[PDB]
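Bench log, entry 3. Co-assembly request; chain sequences pasted below exactly as received.
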Amino acid sequence: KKVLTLEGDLVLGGLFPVHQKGGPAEDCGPVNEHRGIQRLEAMLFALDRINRDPHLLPGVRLGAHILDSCSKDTHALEQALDFVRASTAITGVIGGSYSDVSIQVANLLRLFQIPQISYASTSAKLSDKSRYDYFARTVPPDFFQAKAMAEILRFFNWTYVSTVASEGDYGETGIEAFELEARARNISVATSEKVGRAMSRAAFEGVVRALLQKPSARVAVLFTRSEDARELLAASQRLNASFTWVASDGWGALEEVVAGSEGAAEGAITIELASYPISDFASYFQSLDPWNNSRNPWFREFWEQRFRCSFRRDCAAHSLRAVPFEQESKIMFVVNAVYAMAHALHNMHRALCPNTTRLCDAMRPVNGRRLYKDFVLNVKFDAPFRPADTHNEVRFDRFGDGIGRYNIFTYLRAGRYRYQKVGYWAEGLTLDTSLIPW
Amino acid sequence: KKVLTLEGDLVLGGLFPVHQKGGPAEDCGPVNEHRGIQRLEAMLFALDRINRDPHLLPGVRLGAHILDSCSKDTHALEQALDFVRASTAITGVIGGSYSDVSIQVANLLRLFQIPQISYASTSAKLSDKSRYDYFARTVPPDFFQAKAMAEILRFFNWTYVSTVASEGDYGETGIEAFELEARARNISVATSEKVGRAMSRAAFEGVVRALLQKPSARVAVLFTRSEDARELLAASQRLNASFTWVASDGWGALEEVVAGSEGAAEGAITIELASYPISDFASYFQSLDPWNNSRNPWFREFWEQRFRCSFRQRDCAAHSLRAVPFEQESKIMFVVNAVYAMAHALHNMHRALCPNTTRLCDAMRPVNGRRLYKDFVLNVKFDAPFADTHNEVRFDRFGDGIGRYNIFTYLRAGGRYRYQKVGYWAEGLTLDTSLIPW
Ligand SMILES: *[C@@H]1O[C@H](CO)[C@@H](O)[C@H](O)[C@H]1NC(C)=O
Ligand SMILES: *[C@@H]1O[C@H](CO)[C@@H](O)[C@H](O)[C@H]1NC(C)=O
Ligand SMILES: *[C@@H]1O[C@H](CO)[C@@H](O)[C@H](O)[C@H]1NC(C)=O
Ligand SMILES: *[C@@H]1O[C@H](CO)[C@@H](O)[C@H](O)[C@H]1NC(C)=O
Ligand SMILES: N[C@@H](CCC(=O)O)C(=O)O
Ligand SMILES: N[C@@H](CCC(=O)O)C(=O)O
Ligand SMILES: [Cl-]
Ligand SMILES: [Cl-]
Ligand code: NA
Ligand code: NA
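Structure output for the full assembly:
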């Protein structure tokens, strides 16, 4: 229903799982605090900074037309019609998160030559430029995540494993790639399970029971969406079932996956893409207020849900400074996707509009084929808001993908349950066995 | 670039793979004589009959707007925008052939609530009405075909087999369903191979080689697209490899698959949806003439290919479709039935919305797609044109057809090679050891 509109000379599209998947009839569910709100706000932060930047499109304002995917490819695609209907023109799209969402959206935007930059979609299917010719991403393909996951097993001599894959382009392509890597290291698969789009608590229990039918396969490798990783952990908890979980970025370092199921989750090894916190973001975010942030139509809902109050009194009294703030793992890539589009446009403007700083005729409208092929693919700049002791640059390969760098974690009970970095993967596995309590 | 347009009070969209997929350079390849031209002609034959049927839309003429998918979902989608650009009006769409084409097209037509009836897409994925809520088919899902294939292996006691699947929604979903059915019948897979969308002749040879590495498994189960089955057989020929093929409807009883590779194909068991010849279609098709077939934009191109002639060279008139042999394409019955299904739906809607006239009343200008699909398309029940007994045209709760398959064996007699109907599957396997020569 709602849309976040911000005005400008060039309008950037945006797609975020602001809401979780709806019920059996509802299309949209509850607010996604981390991968929704924080991620969307990060696009707003980035845009704000680009529009105050004398070196980045100094005479061209970048607007936004941001949509909620509701963590659902079908909802996202009905919403995405807004990007293509003027065929107010959309110059390029930032998103989405889920691969199923970015794939559906890419099939649509290529028809209208609209460049797309995802900040979290890691499915390897997206590397195919015969199919997704207008898509690029600031994250790498799962090509590399799979290989890392297999090297992790091979390191601890975990040679008889089970797999759980969410149905679709992320889960299915993720685990297949994992299996080929595992075979090559003499790792055999006991059983392979799939998780449907619509599964009951009972259905999930049946998956856990299916994994328990192979008592020798204590290690379970997941290439699952967050919600499926959550639901599977919750079923393990309800059945006092014990597995050593090795999981992909879907689960990653999210506290909402493990909440309520800490016991079942304890001892898990998870992977998240390597990133850094961006100070200026935490300041921007924690300073948001429901009276000052009206441009975000989903902020009021988040505020009510976070503080368990209603404006319809004293809800306004709360502060995001008063509460603990943990920055989402992929915030970096959100900010980098927007800057990649902004630098692409600025470079296009430098080549096409030399006599002015305003949008010339050559950019009324912007040719998407030229934009993607000649400028988006060719950006190369220092990551903005990166810490002074870090040397990250934003660029894409020939196929529009980012560079394969991951962090590796363990979920342990310290007596709070926390995520602990125990290593990394960067064209080879590195891990400190001292940090893992087994 | 071309489109078949016919005038009517109501315009039915069409989607056929008139061309094969392009090469490394091109988008479209050579003409598809059987599953392209013949299937398309069957829609035209069907529209003509309905347009002179005194008991089926006697006052509403059905026109057409037929498109070439080029055996490729990206191309098909670029073409399918023609169907949705009204927001001339397209009432419903007939097609496509390939599952990947039908799925993508459905992902678009649902957004504009356009009913779609496929005559050949068998992917079990298309049974999901939470995703493909405007899709129906005159064919059953591959859930039944995979069961039939597994049952054949079981009967002949073929415990150790290999699998070859095509990349996509047909190959991948179908072979995963056979894999389920093989497990449950104590049948084990030696190796699972996958064929890509753009493989080469040397790459096809490597799949054959990968299969040969496991010499205990001489039986290869295929869930492949015709072009892949053709290419894979050619490589088995070239490398003098010997396998017992068990193929799905993709191969079916197509002579183009086995042409020039007959030796490598001997003994092969194939599945194909049970269908009957339509003599009137045969006569009609054989009567077609480069000079009387102006309404089909691709027919002059089909003639030059089929008869290796050229209209510029004035050497095409010499040939006839009457002087050459005529094998009806196995799924012609489902093309006709799909067209009629939509006609009956529109007729039934007319009875309800225009009671005082045979002409299109205002209550059906425009036709409401939601109502057409939900209240009329899913509810049709009529005897299939061309025995009025109890073999009818109707859709199940998931908008699918009835699981009836003929089983064939490729053999030689009195070179010369043929497909021999050695059995069937219609709620259980019913083959015959007498007709199989081994
Ligand atoms: C895995 O096995 C090798 C070889 O037997 C051994 O050297 C290594 O220490 C083992 N790794 C772990 C983490 O147990
Ligand atoms: C949970 O499982 C472990 C291992 O089988 C067992 O020692 C423990 O008592 C179980 N607890 C319950 C309540 O089932
Ligand atoms: C399969 O094996 C069973 C049991 O050994 C046997 O009765 C049956 O005839 C065999 N089928 C064929 C086709 O040889
Ligand atoms: C093909 O292989 C068979 C069995 O080894 C053999 O009889 C036949 O002569 C071979 N043909 C060629 C051309 O190598
Ligand atoms: N990388 C996951 C998305 C997980 C995330 O949103 O961070 C995917 O490709 O669907
Ligand atoms: N069953 C195949 C179509 C093959 C045919 O067109 O005959 C599919 O779903 O892609
Ligand atoms: Cl998303
Ligand atoms: Cl098609
Ligand atoms: Na600026
Ligand atoms: Na009629």
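Chain A touches chain B at residues 74, 77-78, 81, 104, 107-108, 110-111, 130-131, 197-198 (CB under 8 Å). Residues B 155-157 surround 2-acetamido-2-deoxy-beta-D-glucopyranose (ligand 3) (CB under 6 Å).
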